């Protein structure tokens, strides 16, 4: 019954049928994006209208379309032709991943470049890389991918060990033409292999690890109903999945006594970008919007038991559209389980004689995706005590280059002749807040140091201050770790038993934000990434911090455009957009396959409850 | 055989015997501190000399002594009388915890104060609190404790719910006299109970938690030999225990191929302080050095299985001295176990077809201590990938006060009339570094942003810089989260296969440091807490950032005095002292017993290894 249920194979087939019937999905059409839309505000009272949004590409060169369909009613709600030079190109298509290599393989300029390096064309892999927006006037309105080459010595070889530096090509993937081949000079192609399953490199595998067995003999403590509605230790939510964003959480709420209290209406990673900090012309255009350009959900891994997810696991298998509108299941693409999380609360009291210990747990909802060389795990955690946390786990194989003779200020050395350009991985979490309902506001809270003097004669006092963010023009904020800066989302009309507005406090990691010069193309295209926290007034068309069409799209859309409306956010339906990232100077330990590193944020209750919410957790 | 083995009951009895024989431990003597000393540098070549350091108090008012004993040889090495007005009072004795309440109960000023508030003296608990150093000239050279009162309605009641504000007393615990009773006026004693095992407050306990069973059917992957030598997944270390510092790690090293490579010679929490930020004269003197004044090891809990520590647990039961020199065992005071830690590394490669997943694990060494109202867990983690981490878990019951009518800038409200003064918990980790041996140096590494222009025409480049800390005068450093500041400890004479010095990078949480005015007593006594990172040249008498005797001791010792020597630290035997803390504005959710909150730091290999050290971890 839930209008927040996952899309079914039947719904996708039905979208396909509706589009076909309407004349919108002929043989030259391809689906670049398809997803279910969330219910409108206040829609709970009226019957279901399941609506799907679709981006349709045309392989014959005609203009693409944005279409909204009502699958409930079997109708097209809207269909509009896109001018991509203005509003952006559609996301990269799965079917385009081979095309850059294939076209380049019979291009005389490319062949000449490979022959100069004594490389067999049959062994040269070409990564199909997003192009961005730079100085090349001919690319405006054209679907371009750029290609960087990596040598694969044999079918099972890791090509990332053998980058071909000094060479890049640009390709029109619709007209199937090579627009440019740039060769700045030969660099040695690094020779050592990076085959992390080769016994010669691993050596003898360890025999020292004894098994760890995690079981739940009575099954898990959470229930799943309606396909994707979770109930666990007072928490209530729906687990969505979108081909762009991946796992999306809806209707996060906590049952406090008899009342189901909303906390967050929708939580997602709405963008993620990987900007590279190497000024070589071979890579200086490199910025991968894994979410906006590639669609991270589309590449979600099938997760194997006792392996990717350990313990008593409940899986969801979300369905997405292929390029023709046929449903494709991602088998075991979402893991759900609960985990022990050490001590929750503990006190041994001298005066009462009472010794008390309770254990913590968390509910985990995750998926893992692969974007070329990168693999990322996206983890959402709900804790017994009301805390909500997100963690990203970055692994895979680092993107490589040559390591210049005489070193580099922008590239680290991994192996002889092998470099790894510096880069960042920067995420935007979009948290459509609903603290005890939709009437919310945000305050920035700083620690306040106090001067020794009257009222503070021993110079020990310290305090804090809160500044309400009243309008969008005032709500673009930066971190200040030194002053312990956090942001509190509260409901000014809902008070706890102490007559204080209920709230949740966002605790950031205060990692560096986007490092690029403010006048760069990337600082404009990923403007969201330049500041730690943005707050907007909710609008149904304000979905991504980079806008709907990121591929080859200049600035003009996204968060800077939204906040220009300067809307009231003081006791209104608001959305918090938190930027957080990893700055990666690759280390030798990252090669040939990288150990996981992490980043994230959390939100903790701040006078939301009337006392600890975990007093009813039982012993042992 | 190991000179790093835990102290045995026999060794403590033997220290007692040696002291007795030497005339140093008559009936009026009490042991305030006793611990084994680490072996001298280069001592491995000569036979064992187990030496113990002892602080001896005299209950009849004579001067205390610092004594070093050789238990191996049965001799007193040194014994010196202390002038406590100069060098500090000895740590608070367990036997003094009752004395403040007992003396106050027959004092007419105290009795008058309680009668003004209609409080039955038999129900008034008095916390025995460290005094610090303020304006009271008569306290210099005297052992003083201060007392704050809390009402206990019945034997099992949580007295913390019922603070008696407006009242404080000072007591000489040797002469057994009450020096001052200060009554600034009556405040309502908060009435609601805080009994977190009372069904009236908890409500019906949850029946929704299904069991989680963590077992190791073949036993653990670590070995323990010589009582406390651990070997686990290439790591090697010895687990020490000291009554002051608690768990101390010695000789942390990693077996890389055939070579045992040192990383850290000694790791401990060498101090921890809890400064309070309430300017009321009732509490403005409050700063608890839990380590230096109270001795956190002494109060380590006995940890119950399936409860405090879950899984296949190996315990150590360290032995300490009681006040008379008799050995006392802390049964199951140290937990050791390995834990699954999610995904270690993962890649699904498009070109090779190879899908690869490996799981991570960590070795955990922990203890939990109780200091009055506070309970703290101290956790050390070793990970497969070479990472070393510390985490402190803070829980217990918050220290309370009245909540003033009309609010407070320095106290939060928890319940009707019940306040919690703002405070911090600030730790100092002392890391005697040995990166590939003792010849080490520290660099501060910052991210470097670059301007769009020649050499960087697209404005995408970013870099980093490292500054070697060459002498102690230059090695007192602050955090800079915005620039991604870290500190690298390297060995300039030990290079990896890429001709780079091997190293480890310290990643701080960049939480606020000590907030008190720089001219306060606490800023001087806890000077270490005002800066994030200090580096000293190793010296055997430079053990604690606050010096040997913290109780009622002004500035003059500790880190500021050590670094004045301005010694060479550029390729020398050095020690890193990292300050990290929690700033706590108590929330309603913290009452009546606080959910765990955490702080810590970690160190990750940085070109220490020649490639990933976990390529030999087996599948599944
Ligand atoms: Cu990276
Ligand atoms: Cu605290
Ligand atoms: Na909202
Ligand atoms: Na050292």
Nearest CA in chain B to A486: B511
Resolution (A): 1.7
Superfamily of the domain at B196-619: Copper amine oxidase, catalytic domain (2.70.98.20)
Q: Kindly give, in sequence order, each residue whose CB lies less than 8 Å from that of residue B154, ignoring residues fewer than 6 positions away.
A: none
Contact criterion met (CB < 8 Å) for A152 and B347: no
- Give how far Cα B183 sits from Cα of A42, B134, B138, B187, B417, Å: 59, 18, 20, 10, 19
Distance of alpha carbon B34 from alpha carbon B325, whole angstroms: 9
State which residue of chain B sits closest to A478, comparing Cα positions.
Answer: B482
Q: SS3 string of A369-405?
A: EEECCEEEEEEEEEECCCCEEEEEEEEECCCCEECCC
DSSP label at residue B292:
I
Cβ atoms within 10 Å of B541's Cβ, excluding its own = 7
Tokens of B422: 């703002």
- Please state, in angstroms and rounded to a whole number, the distance separating the CA atoms of residues A600 and A579: 10
Ligand 4 centroid, distance to B505 Cα (angstroms): 15
- Strand pairing partners for A580? A427
Give the C-alpha separation, B429 to B239, whole Å.
16
**A68 and A37 in contact (C-beta within 8 Å)?**
yes
User: B39 and B3 in contact (C-beta within 8 Å)?
Assistant: yes
CA neighbor of A537 nearest in space, from A437, A417, A441: A441
Q: Which of B365, B359, B367, B429 is nearest to B232 (CA)?
A: B365
Q: How far apart are alpha carbons B521 and A126 in whole angstroms?
A: 65
Exposed/middle/buried for residue A24 (C-beta within 10 Å: 0-12, 13-18, 19+): middle
A349 and B416 within 8 Å at the Cβ level: the answer is: no
Q: Cα(A399) to centroid of ligand 1, in Å?
A: 8
Distance B574 CA to ligand 4 centre (A): 4
Tokens 């009752």 found at: B98
Nearest CA to B191 out of B413, B408, B417 is that of B417
Nearest ligand, measured from the Cα of A596 = 1
Q: Considering A374, A381, A383, A504, which one is annotated as catalytic?
A: A374
Q: Which residue of B has its CA nearest to A383?
A: B595
Is A584 labelled a binding residue? yes
Give the number of whichever ligand sits closest to the CA of residue B275. Answer: 2
| Tokens standing for residue A314 | 């409940």
Distance CA A245, CA A290 (A): 10
- Bridge partners (DSSP) listed for residue B359: B343
Q: Is A290 an active-site residue?
A: yes
Q: Which of B235, B584, B218, B588 is nearest to B380 (CA)?
A: B235
Does residue B374 have a known ligand-binding role? yes
Q: Give domain limits for chain B.
A: 1-87, 94-195, 196-619
- CB within 8 Å: B356 and A588: no
CB neighbourhood size of A498 (10 A): 15
What lies within 8 Å, CB to CB, of A555 at 6+ separation is A524, A525, A527
Give the separation between CA A589 and CA A591, rounded to whole angstroms: 5
Token pair for residue A391? 């963690």
Torsion, CA A298, CA A538, CA A598, CA B274, rounded to 10: -160
Contact: B339, A212; criterion CB under 8 Å:
yes
Ligand 3 centre and the CA of A72: distance in Å?
26
The H or E element containing residue A182 is: strand A177-183
How far off is chain B from A493, nearest CA to CA, in Å? 18
B33 is in an annotated binding site: no
Q: What are the C-alpha distances in Å from A383 to residues A343, A605, A619, B42?
A: 12, 11, 17, 49
Taking contacts as CB-CB distances below 8 angstroms, the residues of chain B near A126 are: none
* 3-state per-residue secondary structure call for B68-116: EEECCCCEEEEEEECCHHHHCCCCCCHHHCCHHHHHHCCCHHHHHHHHH
CB A201 within 8 A of CB B615: yes
H and E: helices and strands count for chain A = 7, 34
Positive or negative, the CA dihedral B607, B608, B610, B616 is negative
- Kindly determine whether residue B616 and residue A395, on different chains, have CB atoms separated by under 8 Å: no
| A86, containing H or E segment | helix A84-87
Q: Would you say how long chain A is, in residues? A: 620
- Tokens 């301005």 correspond to B566
What DSSP letter does each residue of B345-369 carry, written as one string?
EEEE-TTT--EEEEEEEEEEEEEEE
Q: From B429, B15, B506, B96, select the one nearest B245 (Cα to Cα).
A: B429
Quote the ligand 3 centre to A87 CA distance (angstroms): 27
Q: How far is the CA of A402 from the centre of ligand 4 (A)?
A: 37
What does DSSP assign to residue A294?
I
Residues of A in contact with B511 (CB under 8 A): 481, 484
Q: Quick one: which ligand is closest to B263's CA?
A: 4
Q: Which of A472, A464, A470, A537 is nearest to A505 (CA)?
A: A464
Query: Which residues, in sequence order, are bridge partners of residue A369?
Result: A300, A376
Tell me which H or E stretch contains A200: helix A199-202
CA distance B559 to A334: 51
Structure tokens at B494: 């030990």
Q: Name the minimum distance, in Å, from the CA of A210 to any CA of chain B.
A: 5
Tokens of B551: 């109780």
Q: Give, rounded to a whole angstrom, the gap between the first and last alpha carbons of chain A.
A: 38
Ligand nearest to the CA of A395: 1
Cα–Cα dist B328/B318, whole Å: 9
- State whether B459 and A512 contact (CB < 8 Å): no
Hey, how many other C-beta atoms are within 10 angstroms of the C-beta on A459?
19
Distance (Å, whole) CA B536 – CA B387 = 23
Which of A372, A608, A616 shows the shortest C-beta gap to B204?
A616
The CA–CA distances, whole Å, from B554 to B61, B299, B515, B527, B549 equal 21, 25, 19, 11, 10
Question: Which residues place a Cβ less than 5 A from the ion ligand 2?
Answer: B 584
The reply to whether B383 sits in an annotated binding site is no
Is the Cα torsion angle A518, A523, A527, A528 positive or negative in sign?
A: negative
Instruction: Choose which CATH entry (3.30.420.40, 3.10.450.40, 3.30.465.10, 3.40.50.200) describes domain B1-87.
Output: 3.10.450.40
Residue B158 Cα distances to A588, B104, B198, B399, B404, angstroms: 54, 21, 11, 12, 21
In Å, how far is A452's CA from the nearest CA of chain B?
Answer: 6
The secondary structure of B505-571, three-state, reads EEEECCCCCCCCCCCCHHHHHCHHHHCCEEEEECCCCCCCCCCCCCCCCCCCCCHHHHHCCCCECCC
Is B94-195 in the same CATH topology as B1-87?
yes
Distance, CA of B346 to CA of A396 (rounded, Å): 6
Span from the CA of B256 to the centroid of ligand 4 (angstroms): 20
Among residues A191, A194, A189, the alpha carbon closest in space to that of A402 is found at A189
Which single residue is written with the structure tokens 């070697």? B468
Dist CA A529 CA A509 (whole Å): 14
The beta strands (E) that lie in A479-573 are given as 486-495, 501-508, 533-537
Provide, as residue numbers in chain A, all residues whose Cβ is less than 8 Å from the Cβ of B519. Answer: 452, 459
Q: Which residue of A has its CA nearest to B235?
A: A208
- Residue A354: list chain B partners with CB under 8 A: 156, 158, 197
Cα B322 from Cα B203, distance rounded (Å): 42
Q: Torsion over CA of A213, A214, A215 and A216, rounded to 10 degrees? A: 160
Give the A:B interface size as CB pairs under 8 Å: 441
How far apart are the C-alpha atoms of B328 and B322, rounded to whole Å? Answer: 6
Which residues on B lie below 8 Å from A340 (Cβ)?
212, 214, 310
Give the CA-trace dihedral at B323, B327, B328, B333, to 10 degrees: 120
Rounded to whole angstroms, what are the CA distances from B101 to A60, B146, B168? Answer: 90, 10, 12
Which residue bears the tokens 């893992």? A368
Q: Are A592 and B612 inside 8 Å of each other by CB?
A: yes
How remote is the CA of residue B587 from the centroid of ligand 3, in Å?
Answer: 24
The nearest CA of chain B is from the CA of A306 a distance in Å of: 7
Rounded to a whole number, what is the distance in Å from the CA of B497 to chain A's nearest CA? Answer: 8
Q: Say if residues A182 and A148 touch (Cβ distance below 8 Å).
A: no
Catalytic residue check, B374: yes
Report the gap between the CA of B284 and the closest CA in chain A (Å): 7
Annotated catalytic residue, options B278, B290, B385, B590 = B290
Q: Which of B312, B307, B304 is nearest to B333 (CA)?
A: B304
How far is B115 from chain A, CA to nearest CA, in Å? 22
CATH architecture of B94-195: Roll (3.10)
Q: Is B441 helix (H, G, I), strand (E, B) or coil?
A: strand
Of B386, B396, B515, the CB nearest to A447: B515
Tokens for A41? 């505000």
Ligand nearest to the CA of B585: 2
Nearest CB to A483; choose among B447, B498, B512: B512
Chain B interface mutation, best of A212, A216, A422, A610, highest count of B Cβ atoms under 10 Å = A212
Q: Is B463 in contact with A277 (CB distance < 8 Å)?
A: yes
> How many Å apart are CA B469 and CA A120, to the nearest integer?
50
């Amino acid at each position: 019954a839930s209008p927040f249920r996952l899309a079914s194979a039947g719904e996708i087939s039905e979208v396909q049928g509706i589009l076909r019937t309407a004349g919108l999905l002929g043989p030259e059409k391809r689906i670049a994006y398809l997803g279910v839309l969330d219910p409108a505000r206040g829609a709970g009272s009226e019957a279901e209208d399941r609506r799907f949004r679709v981006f349709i590409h045309d392989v014959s060169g005609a203009r693409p379309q944005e279409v909204t369909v009502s699958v409930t009613n079997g109708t097209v709600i809207s269909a509009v032709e896109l001018d991509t030079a203005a509003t952006g190109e559609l996301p990269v298509l799965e079917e385009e991943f081979e095309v850059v290599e294939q076209l380049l393989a019979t291009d005389e300029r490319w062949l000449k470049a490979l022959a100069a390096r004594n490389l067999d064309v049959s062994k040269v892999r070409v990564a199909p890389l997003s192009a961005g927006v730079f100085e090349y006037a001919e690319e405006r309105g054209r679907r371009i991918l750029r290609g960087l080459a990596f040598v694969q010595d044999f079918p099972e070889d890791s090509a990332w060990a053998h980058p071909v530096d000094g060479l890049v090509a640009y390709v029109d993937v619709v007209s199937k033409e090579v627009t440019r081949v740039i060769d700045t000079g030969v660099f040695p192609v690094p020779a050592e292999h990076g085959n992390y399953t080769d016994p010669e490199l691993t050596g003898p595998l360890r025999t020292t690890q004894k098994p760890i067995s995690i079981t739940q003999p009575e099954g898990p403590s959470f229930t799943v109903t309606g396909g994707n509605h979770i109930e666990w230790e007072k928490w209530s939510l729906d687990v969505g999945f979108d081909v762009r964003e991946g796992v999306v959480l809806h209707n996060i709420a906590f049952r406090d006594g008899d009342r189901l209290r909303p906390i967050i209406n929708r939580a997602s990673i709405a963008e993620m970008v990987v900007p590279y900090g190497d000024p070589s012309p071979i890579r200086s255009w490199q910025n991968y919007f894994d979410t906006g350009e590639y669609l991270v959900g589309q590449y979600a891994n099938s997760l194997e038991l006792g392996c990717d997810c350990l313990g008593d696991i409940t899986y969801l298998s979300p369905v997405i559209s292929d390029a023709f509108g046929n449903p494709r299941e991602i088998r075991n693409g979402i893991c759900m389980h609960e985990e022990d999380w050490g001590i929750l609360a503990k006190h041994s009291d001298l005066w009462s004689g009472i010794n008390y210990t309770r254990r913590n747990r968390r509910m985990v909802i995750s998926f893992f995706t692969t974007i070329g060389n990168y693999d990322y795990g996206f983890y959402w955690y709900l804790y017994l005590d009301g805390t909500i946390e997100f963690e990203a786990k970055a692994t895979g194989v680092v993107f490589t280059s040559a390591f210049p003779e005489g070193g580099s200020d922008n590239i680290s050395q991994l192996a002889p002749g092998l470099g790894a350009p510096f880069h960042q991985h920067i995420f935007s979490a979009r948290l459509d807040m609903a603290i005890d309902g939709f009437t919310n506001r945000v305050e920035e809270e700083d620690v306040v140091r106090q001067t020794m003097g009257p009222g503070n004669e021993r110079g020990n006092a310290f305090s804090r201050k809160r500044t309400v963010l009243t309008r969008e023009s005032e709500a673009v904020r930066e971190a200040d770790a030194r002053t312990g800066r956090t942001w509190i989302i509260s409901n000014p009309e809902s008070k706890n038993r102490l007559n204080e507005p209920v709230g949740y406090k966002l605790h950031a990691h205060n990692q560096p934000t986007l490092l690029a010069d403010p006048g760069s193309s990337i600082a404009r295209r990923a403007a969201f990434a330049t500041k730690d926290l943005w707050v907007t007034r909710y609008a149904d068309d304000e979905r991504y911090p980079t806008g709907d069409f990121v591929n080859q799209h200049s600035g003009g859309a996204g968060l800077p455009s939204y906040i220009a409306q300067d809307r009231d956010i003081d006791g209104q339906d608001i959305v918090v957009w938190h930027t957080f990232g990893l700055t990666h100077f690759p280390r030798v330990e990252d090669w040939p396959i990288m150990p996981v590193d992490t980043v994230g944020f959390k939100l903790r209750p701040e006078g939301f409850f009337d006392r600890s919410p975990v007093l009813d957790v039982p012993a042992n």
